[PDB]
Amino acid sequence: GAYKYLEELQRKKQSDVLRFLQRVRVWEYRQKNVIHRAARPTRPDKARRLGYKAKQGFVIYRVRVRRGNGVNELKYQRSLRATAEERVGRRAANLRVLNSYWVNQDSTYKYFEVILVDPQHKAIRRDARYNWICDPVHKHREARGLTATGKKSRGINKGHKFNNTKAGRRKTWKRQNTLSLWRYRK
Amino acid sequence: MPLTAVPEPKRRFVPSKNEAKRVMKIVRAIREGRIIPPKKLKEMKEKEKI
Amino acid sequence: SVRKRKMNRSSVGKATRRNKDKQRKINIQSNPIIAANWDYSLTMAQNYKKLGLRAKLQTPAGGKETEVVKKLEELASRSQSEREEEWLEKLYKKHGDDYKKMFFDKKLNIYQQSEGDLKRRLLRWKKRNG
Amino acid sequence: VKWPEYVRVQRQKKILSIRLKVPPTIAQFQYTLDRNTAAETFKLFNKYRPETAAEKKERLTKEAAAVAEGASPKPYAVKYGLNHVVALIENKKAKLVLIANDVDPIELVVFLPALCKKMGVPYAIVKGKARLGTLVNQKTSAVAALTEVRAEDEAALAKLVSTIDANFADKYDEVKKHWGGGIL
Amino acid sequence: TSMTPAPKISYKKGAASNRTKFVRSLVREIAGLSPYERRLIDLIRNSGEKRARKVAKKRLGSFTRAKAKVEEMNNIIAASRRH
RNA sequence: GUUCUUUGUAAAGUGCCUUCGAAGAGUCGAGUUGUUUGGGAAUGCAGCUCUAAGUGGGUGGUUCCAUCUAAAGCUAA
RNA sequence: GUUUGACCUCAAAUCAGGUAGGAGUACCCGCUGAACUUAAGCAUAUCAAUAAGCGGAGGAAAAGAAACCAACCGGGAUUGCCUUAGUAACGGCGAGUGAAGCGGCAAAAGCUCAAAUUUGAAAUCUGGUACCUUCGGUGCCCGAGUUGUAAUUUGGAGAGGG
């Protein structure tokens, strides 16, 4: 194919080709708006393996976020990527945030390219592989951390290590902090 | 040598079956009468727009 | 309450639904043989052992041929297209039974099919004909 | 004078394209096939336009209107998707692979000239993705390949290979070296 | 008694795959080198593998990282110089 | 239940023989400040520095062994 | 050719068609986040990953088909209940905090993409438009699209032939 050549190309980020590509594009993205729409994905390989199909109803938005946070280390423990996903969720409120990836970074700003599906588009409402997003249980997945990075920041996975946050940390706290009393007292 | 030793399929040598599917779909549409054939389409404009 | 207080005071009327007796006794639907022989006074598992059929394949927690013959009774009890038929007519009339020559022919076997495909399809053609 | 935002951006990007030192896997583009050889490549490539959607529809209704009431060789056309071209190359099914110099993300087609030099596929970086688009019923194509050919066009194709080898690959053996864009 | 179980994914662990070896090495030559690797290949020729692995270990995560990386760079040199 | 349509060298499945055969990177990881956990094993996460490999890689268990396939997505009770 | 024409990017339009906000908020998913108090006076700690604040969903939400647990004669998505169990572990080892595997039971269900050429044929789709048996179908047209929509394939392998 062609995307394996692309995939293994973008794994080298400080390599002289992709160094130059990233040098031009970081400046070019500064000259535009903060949240603006991309004509097409810059990394179509990574877009596609995160589930971007180049068809009507699929949108790529490019987004910018400030970096960082002991007053200057009063932390703010939510990610930069979740902040970005939420902002594009509000400017494009008719869409549904599917996934997002890293494109270019800087001293001040990390950039992302969110991928968005139009659930009202009839090319999405048919085709039984993508019409799950039209179900109203996906209205703002990025606002509730149901995206890839949100599920990471929530700490939702499997095992010993995620026992405090496997069904969600609020749910497990409320469950284990409940005096359960039966009719015939145990 | 080429990178992979993938066996070439029959369809790369045989006449295409997707083409056969489309043809045998239009065939049905002509029997049903919902596609007017290219031969009669001339006759529909030889009688009209005069 | 706030909303319930008004709704119990208004002249609109409540949307009263008396669906409590329907929760216990749901009619059996998927099989008319079972639908005729199901004692509604008995429970689920009692109506299974009455008929004979096993209700739970794992051994339950706790302490626990009249109709199955009728089921056994009702359980003991692809043509070719015009173009495909005419294609096999052409192959048989030109060759006969020489499948090596029949499949190496560029004019009639346009799809480069094997010998087994040809003898199977021709026998389907021969069974439907004389 | 005062220009718009986007006009200023594309003019700034134009001067940025020149004034930076560039890595030699890029600027291996823009060292591209000249006017005569480009016109002669297309004089062959125009004979193999993929059958346009209208032409295919009318012909396959002609098949239906004839064959349902009352042998052909496999037809040859140019091959035009990047997944399909980089499939064809490395399987050595490519005799001439044409690569556009202007691609929206440049990173897409950077491996392709050197993968063609690796496989022994006689490639030519031709100027314009629009110009490749024209011969292929698409707006843009990025890549166009010529696998198989009619025997009338075979000798011309083999000479097109040898002309491109001499004109392109021999004049631009220095292009694998030398970081481009040192223009003062 | 044992029943000789079905094979799994990392039992044929990293199945060779002639094509991906080719693709990784194909991108390796095209992309150039990262600025530290660019220093690392100068450091092998001048100072040797001793200090080269020292810098690589500080740069990367663990020592097993620095093994594979300096050897990778030694194959860059072994191909570029001779063949 | 009754009934109208089904087609096209159409779509599958079983067993054997024969030829091949990829698997998610600013991500894992490492350091680091801060938060957080029952998690002393440094439990999770966030920011910042640096940043991998494919007979890979992760997680456990007294020379090794076992068991998973990450960094993509849906799904009732 | 000092002309004409492809594209690329960026706009506009009371353009055609859509869609987002606000309410409710018990439960549910996030973000943000204290203090009174309790600890011997008390920067850790505790109340508490609580209340308040802000966003986002549904009939449930979330979770979910292992980068899981184990160390067995091995189990096998999640969730929930009894049990583990005030156990392991944390803590001026102080006030105090505090699980999980196993076993029983409730309920159970599995799958889908990206990455290997349809290349004997973009097989795909949206809209406009005229009919019809109208949660749609059919015909024609403008497009989206090869910087990849379809069919095949997902490790339990799988694919091409016989």
From Swiss-Prot, chain A:
Function comment: Component of the ribosome, a large ribonucleoprotein complex responsible for the synthesis of proteins in the cell. The small ribosomal subunit (SSU) binds messenger RNAs (mRNAs) and translates the encoded message by selecting cognate aminoacyl-transfer RNA (tRNA) molecules. The large subunit (LSU) contains the ribosomal catalytic site termed the peptidyl transferase center (PTC), which catalyzes the formation of peptide bonds, thereby polymerizing the amino acids delivered by tRNAs into a polypeptide chain.
SMART domains, alphabetized: Ribosomal_L15e
One GO cellular component term noted in the UniProt record for this chain: cytosol
GO terms for biological process, alphabetical: cytoplasmic translation
Organism of origin: Saccharomyces cerevisiae (strain ATCC 204508 / S288c) (Baker's yeast)
Encoding gene (name): RPL15A
Domain of life per record: Eukaryota
Protein's name according to its UniProt entry: Large ribosomal subunit protein eL15A
Region feature (Disordered): 146-167
Extent of Basic residues compositional bias: 151-167
Keywords (A to Z) from UniProt: Cytoplasm, Ribonucleoprotein, Ribosomal protein
Keyword Glycoprotein: no
Swiss-Prot record, chain B:
Subcellular location: Nucleus, Nucleolus; Nucleus, Nucleoplasm
Entry function: Component of the NOP7 complex, which is required for maturation of the 25S and 5.8S ribosomal RNAs and formation of the 60S ribosome.
Family of this protein: Belongs to the WD repeat BOP1/ERB1 family.
Additional information: Present with 2680 molecules/cell in log phase SD medium.
Quaternary organization: Component of the NOP7 complex, composed of ERB1, NOP7 and YTM1. The complex is held together by ERB1, which interacts with NOP7 via its N-terminal domain and with YTM1 via a high-affinity interaction between the seven-bladed beta-propeller domains of the 2 proteins. The NOP7 complex associates with the 66S pre-ribosome. Also interacts with NOG1.
Name of the featured protein: Ribosome biogenesis protein ERB1
Source organism of the structure: Saccharomyces cerevisiae (strain ATCC 204508 / S288c) (Baker's yeast)
Gene of this entry: ERB1
Swiss-Prot record, chain D:
GO biological processes: cytoplasmic translation; maturation of LSU-rRNA
Major localization listed first in the record, in broad terms: cytoplasm
Signal sequence range: none
Keywords attached to this entry: Cytoplasm, Ribonucleoprotein, Ribosomal protein
Keyword Ribonucleoprotein recorded: yes
GO cellular component terms listed in the entry, alphabetical order: cytosol; cytosolic large ribosomal subunit
Cell location: Cytoplasm
GO molecular function, a single term: structural constituent of ribosome
General function of this protein: Component of the ribosome, a large ribonucleoprotein complex responsible for the synthesis of proteins in the cell. The small ribosomal subunit (SSU) binds messenger RNAs (mRNAs) and translates the encoded message by selecting cognate aminoacyl-transfer RNA (tRNA) molecules. The large subunit (LSU) contains the ribosomal catalytic site termed the peptidyl transferase center (PTC), which catalyzes the formation of peptide bonds, thereby polymerizing the amino acids delivered by tRNAs into a polypeptide chain.
Family note: Belongs to the eukaryotic ribosomal protein eL8 family.
UniProt subunit comment: Component of the large ribosomal subunit (LSU). Mature yeast ribosomes consist of a small (40S) and a large (60S) subunit. The 40S small subunit contains 1 molecule of ribosomal RNA (18S rRNA) and 33 different proteins (encoded by 57 genes). The large 60S subunit contains 3 rRNA molecules (25S, 5.8S and 5S rRNA) and 46 different proteins (encoded by 81 genes).
Note: Present with 238000 molecules/cell in log phase SD medium.
Protein name listed in UniProt: Large ribosomal subunit protein eL8A
Gene: RPL8A
Swiss-Prot record, chain E:
GO molecular function: RNA binding; structural constituent of ribosome
Keyword field: Acetylation, Cytoplasm, Ribonucleoprotein, Ribosomal protein
Extra remark: Present with 31600 molecules/cell in log phase SD medium.
Top-rank taxon: Eukaryota
Any one of the GO CC terms: cytosol
Record carries keyword Ribonucleoprotein: yes
Assembly and oligomerization: Component of the large ribosomal subunit (LSU). Mature yeast ribosomes consist of a small (40S) and a large (60S) subunit. The 40S small subunit contains 1 molecule of ribosomal RNA (18S rRNA) and 33 different proteins (encoded by 57 genes). The large 60S subunit contains 3 rRNA molecules (25S, 5.8S and 5S rRNA) and 46 different proteins (encoded by 81 genes).
Family: Belongs to the eukaryotic ribosomal protein eL36 family.
Function: Component of the ribosome, a large ribonucleoprotein complex responsible for the synthesis of proteins in the cell. The small ribosomal subunit (SSU) binds messenger RNAs (mRNAs) and translates the encoded message by selecting cognate aminoacyl-transfer RNA (tRNA) molecules. The large subunit (LSU) contains the ribosomal catalytic site termed the peptidyl transferase center (PTC), which catalyzes the formation of peptide bonds, thereby polymerizing the amino acids delivered by tRNAs into a polypeptide chain.
One GO process term, biological-process aspect: cytoplasmic translation
Range within the parent protein: 18 to 100 of 100
Primary location: cytoplasm
Post-translational modification: N-terminally acetylated by acetyltransferase NatA.
UniProt name for this protein: Large ribosomal subunit protein eL36A
